[model samples]
Target chain A: TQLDIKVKALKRLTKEEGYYQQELKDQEAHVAKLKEDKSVDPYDLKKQEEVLDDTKRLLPTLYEKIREFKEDLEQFLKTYQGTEDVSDARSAITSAQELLDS
Target chain B: TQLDIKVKALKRLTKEEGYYQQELKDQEAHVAKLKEDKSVDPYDLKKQEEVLDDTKRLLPTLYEKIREFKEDLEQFLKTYQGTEDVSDARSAITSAQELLDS
Candidate 1:
């Protein structure tokens, strides 16, 4: 049951993280375009500025959330010796630790 | 000529960054698996621990390098205003700023 709970949470966290990853790329592309324009229209510039601001605000929190999820799952895995996918859990923990360390 | 140089550099930087991204994920997965094993062999654990340490050291430098590349590209884009892919350059700058900020 504990493993199941952890797995479910892990899956959800990974999926959410994936969205953030895509969003991060999109935001980068958008911001790059906005910054490059020398004669950008006022409206477009403002829109892009707002987008960058929103992305900046959202990213840290999202990253933090993902880290937390990984940490929780990692703690569970560290002590977990159940039949379910122990190696996978170990890998996830290692990954989380590296990310958090950085 | 300036634009071409920037573009080539930008392209190379992006490509390099992409590799880092994939490597990061793989390292995470590998580390996770290593950590999760309750009965891991000593050698395997040692190897995994070494991998984690190496990753911890390498990531910061790689991140720094990527940031530098982005900063150079962004600075060029901010003032260049040339005909080539202005919008894409702006978006890249914005993304770089966001990443560096975090």
Candidate 2:
């Protein structure tokens, strides 16, 4: 049961991370195209520049969080056939708490 | 009839330019926040960088187009109260042709 829960959590996180990543990609493409046209509003350009910088800064944290989740899930899998399940479950809880922080 | 059409076209163009500009602003902000995180996917970052450049290139032309339209509309307004209305309408038609190119 613990393994199953950890796996499910990992899966959800993976899917969500992918969704967020794809969203950025589309945004990047749209912004790039907008920048190409010389007639776009200057105010908009300035605003967009700020936005791009923020996005760049936020992404690394998300990737790190996902990696942590992945690591926890792997640990759970490694101990699935043993008596250390309870301790592992405790670790999973801690990891879940940190994931929430993320 | 001609004056009304020109006015309508100008109004439509202004609204559309504002719309496109706002869209870029939202996109910019979104991308910026994504960048702030340390864990964001690196692959996503590379793609977003490309997108930002393209958007930068495209914006100037859009700004130029909007300006041209504004100028033409102003010309139309200046002649709106004159005897040269017919000649001005011809000039507007020529401007419209170029606006299409924009």
Candidate 3:
């Protein structure tokens, strides 16, 4: 039961992590394209300012969620104390980090 | 009659698409935070990944609306093809792009 639960949790964590990473990729691409366009019209500038504000407002909560997710993963690993599950858990941790970094 | 209808449609399409795209971006910023934390807690992650798939589903509709808006804008310009209004229309197009890009 514990193994099954841990495995399910790991899968879910990886999936969420991947989704957010993709979003970051999309954002960076969008930002890059915008930067490529040298002309920043007044109307566009106003819109961008609004978006920047939105980003600022949204970033804090994002950080909070990530922290919480990390903590939960650690807590889940505790159930498998003194087993190879800890090593597997470590690998899951690595995968999670790689997914984010990528 | 066509001019008014098309212009109104263009405005509406732009507004809807703009909202969807903003959602895409907000999704991205939120995802980036999840990625960096580098831990895959399944419970934290499961629904999160579904959100990304949701974005993927939403983007096509967004692009479609944006295309429709562009087509309408072009037709509106055609209404005043030989007038100075063409210049303003062109400027508006540029302005619109800048807003979306930012």
Better model by DockQ: candidate 1 vs candidate 3 = 3
Residue A11 lDDT (model 2): 53
Clashes of each: 15, 57, 3
- In the order shown, the chain A TM-scores of the predictions are 0.71, 0.68, 0.51
Candidate 3, superposed: residue stretches over 4 Å from native:
A45-60, A79-86, A96-102, B1-102
> If the candidates were sorted by their DockQ against the true structure, best first, what order would they fall in?
3, 2, 1
Among these predicted structures, which one has the highest lDDT? Answer: 1
Instruction: Give the Cα lDDT of each candidate.
Output: 0.57, 0.53, 0.52
Per-candidate TM equals: 0.43, 0.39, 0.40
Error of 3 at B43 (Å): 9.0
Model 2 chain A: weakest 10-residue lDDT segment is: A1-10
Which one wins on DockQ? 3
Alpha carbon lDDT at A83, candidate 2 = 50
* Shift of residue A24 alpha carbon in model 1, Å: 2.2
Error of 2 at A90 (Å): 21
Per-candidate interface DockQ score? 0.03, 0.03, 0.08
How do the residues A24-69 of candidate 1 rate in per-residue lDDT, one tens digit apiece?
A: 6865786587568765555444544554464356456545655766
Per-residue CA lDDT of model 3 for B33-73, tens digit only, reads 65566564454445465555555575564445545556557
Ranking by lDDT: 1, 2, 3
